[PDB]
Amino acid sequence: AYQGFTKLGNREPLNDIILWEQITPTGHSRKEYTPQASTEYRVGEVLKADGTKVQAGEEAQADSVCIVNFYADLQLSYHGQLKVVGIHRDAELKDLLTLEASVDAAAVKTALAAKGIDFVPTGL
């Protein structure tokens, strides 16, 4: 290696944060978003109503939590689906949120809790 080491990257997070959700013939707690251009999505990310991620100063606009890893350059998810899917209604999720820079986690959690989403405190 030029620097003495090479790193091929870590495995993307797997969709296992869901501990409980409302089962229904059609997904009652799941919603579909049109993927925004040139945006990379990963499990545990917070999205606004329009499908864009939540940045600092707008935590009150948090709408849903992403569930599928989406590759922008392919315009296709890792499961071959055309759309992004996120949780937007009552459910229990592992406390493994991924947030942008300078985003206050507490505000996001309070905003989401109003929709019935609770976070189980994960161990180590």
Binding site: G4, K7, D16, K94, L96
Partner: protein, 366 residues
């Protein structure tokens, strides 16, 4: 056999032969057998790393019916390059036209003798390079004698390095404390998932460190006050009871606290002219004692070998995807019977899979 006299061509004197001086070679590590041979058919290789951890559990109220959960594991991947070595040599008729053999009177040199000598020199050079590379790998960073950096294990695997200070200069300093620190580090930082005995380790040190350790008052008095063969042998016997390196028939050895200390004098010269001591530590004055510690093979068994060597294929035709060999030697004939030219090739990289188990030892204190 008779030759011309010193100051007259008409008188003869008797020649009694030759005496040869051969440079020293050491090759100590190469004989321990620590490094296994792992030939491969490619110019690179990969590895997978898996990690997980656990923590204590917090009490919750019975009626609330709340609970806890554990985070998932982390998987990662890495890669390695490899080092290539090559050298050339040739034989021409001018080397055998009228050139007397050193040990005789009127016998001429022949192609066979030059061939054998040059091949032996090539093999010696490659052995020296292999020993140097093994020692560099054991230090934790693989760098060519030219100074190029090829592998940095402490960065390839995200981990740091530990140094242990003995403070042998202080008359009141305790050594058992440092030995226990080393043992606990080796026992705790493995994270192999099984029971580990840290008593199984090699400790190779230099001359100054060995002398300071042996002559410390606390060790000397303690071993002097005991009536047992080990005490007698070390205090007033000969400490040279170890194995053989490439030069001397026994290596200085010392026993204390269940640890075995060995003195290694190996050193080589770069073609730039400088001297590369094998046991030294980078950027530390040679006046300070220095050593290196690493686990034994039995500390984990062959099922979990830690040291390996990889061998790649030769660039020439007919070896596109072969398994690879330690050394290749080829010969070709020059144009219109002008001479012979040789070539020797090598392609290897030694590495370690758990670099955090390599600990450096120092005689000073900080």
């Amino acid at each position: 056999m008779l030759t011309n006299s010193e100051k007259s061509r008409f008188f003869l004197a008797d020649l009694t032969g030759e005496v040869q001086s051969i440079p020293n070679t050491y090759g100590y590590i190469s004989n321990l057998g620590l490094f296994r041979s792992a030939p491969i058919t490619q110019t690179t290789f990969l590895m997978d790393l898996t990690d997980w951890d656990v923590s204590l559990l917090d009490a919750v109220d019975r009626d609330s019916r709340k609970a806890e959960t554990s985070a998932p594991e982390r998987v990662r991947q890495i890669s390695f390059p490899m080092m290539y070595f090559k050298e050339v040599e040739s034989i021409t008729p001018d080397e055998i036209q009228g050139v007397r053999q050193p040990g005789t009177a009127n016998e001429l040199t022949t192609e066979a003798v030059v061939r054998a000598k040059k091949l032996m020199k090539i093999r010696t050079k490659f052995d020296i390079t292999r020993e140097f590379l093994f020692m560099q790998a054991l230090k934790g960073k693989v760098v060519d004698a030219r100074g190029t950096l090829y592998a940095d294990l402490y960065k390839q695997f995200d981990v740091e390095k530990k140094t242990v200070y003995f403070d042998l200069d202080n008359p009141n300093a305790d050594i058992d404390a440092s030995i226990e620190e080393l043992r606990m580090h080796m026992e705790d930082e493995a994270k192999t998932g099984t029971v580990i005995n840290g008593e199984e380790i090699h400790v190779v040190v230099d001359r100054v460190f060995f002398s300071k350790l042996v002559k410390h008052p606390k060790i000397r008095d303690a071993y002097l006050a005991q009536q047992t063969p080990l005490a007698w042998q070390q205090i007033t016997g000969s400490l040279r009871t170890g194995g053989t390196d490439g030069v001397q028939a026994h290596m200085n050895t010392f026993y204390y606290g269940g640890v075995k200390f060995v003195q290694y004098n190996g050193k080589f010269k770069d073609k730039r002219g400088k001297v590369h001591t094998l046991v030294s530590i980078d950027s530390v004055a040679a006046t300070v004692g220095v050593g290196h510690a690493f686990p034994n093979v039995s500390m984990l068994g062959e099922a979990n070998n830690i040291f390996e060597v990889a061998y790649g294929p030769c660039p020439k035709m007919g070896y596109a995807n072969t398994l690879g060999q330690e050394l290749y030697v080829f010969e070709y004939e020059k144009d219109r019977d002008e001479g012979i030219d040789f070539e020797a090739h090598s392609y290897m990289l030694p590495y370690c899979t758990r670099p955090q188990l390599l600990v450096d030892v120092r005689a000073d204190a900080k």
